[PDB]
Amino acid sequence: VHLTPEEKSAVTALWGKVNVDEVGGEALGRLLVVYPWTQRFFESFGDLSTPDAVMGNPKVKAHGKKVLGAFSDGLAHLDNLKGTFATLSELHCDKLHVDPENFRLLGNVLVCVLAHHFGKEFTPPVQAAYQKVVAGVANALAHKYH
């Protein structure tokens, strides 16, 4: 949460211009191509033997859509991340058993995804804003491990 307002205003700002319909599938899809092992959690989804394969899929995109929401949700609540992701922290840890290290990887893929969509507009300071954020979320998403 510990973000200067300047960063806080910068975030929502950029955040607004985001295609909430595409970005998440972009992120989660990329997560699988870049970090394959992570596929071991989405066998329920289908063809993921090739990139275009993984990328095309509507579940992967359908899902990232849910994931992003959880992010928007997080952004709208920086002073309460731990609380905001509680059941998720359980779902991912207790039930699913996702290694918390993949929370950080997704967090950084999201950052690459944004960067890809806003080009030069995703400036070094803005990125800095987001890193404090994606770290804030991966970190509270793994709390039921703490």
Partner 1 sequence: VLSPADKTNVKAAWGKVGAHAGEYGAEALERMFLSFPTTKTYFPHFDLSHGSAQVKGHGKKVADALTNAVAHVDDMPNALSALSDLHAHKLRVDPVNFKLLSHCLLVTLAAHLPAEFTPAVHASLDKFLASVSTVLTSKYR
68 contacts which partner out of partner 1, ligand HEM, its own copies, none, CB within 5 to 8 A by kind?
Answer: none
Interface residue with partner 1 among 3, 18, 55, 75 (CB under 8 A) is: 55
User: Is residue 116 a known part of a binding site?
Assistant: no
Whole-number Å distance between alpha carbons of 126 and 44? 36
Interface residue with its own copies among 114, 119, 135, 141 (CB under 8 A) is: 135
Residue 114-133 contact track with partner 1, rule CB under 8 A, x = bound: -xxxxxx-x-xx-xx--x--
Cα–Cα distances in angstroms (integers) from residue 33 to residues 30, 103, 137, in the given order: 5, 16, 22
DSSP string covering 1-59: ----HHHHHHHHHHHHT--TTTHHHHHHHHHHHHSGGGGGG-GGG---SSHHHHHH-HH
Asked if 139 interacts with partner 1 (CB under 8 A), we say: no
1 contacts which partner out of ligand HEM, its own copies, ligand HNI, none, CB within 5 to 8 A by kind?
Answer: its own copies
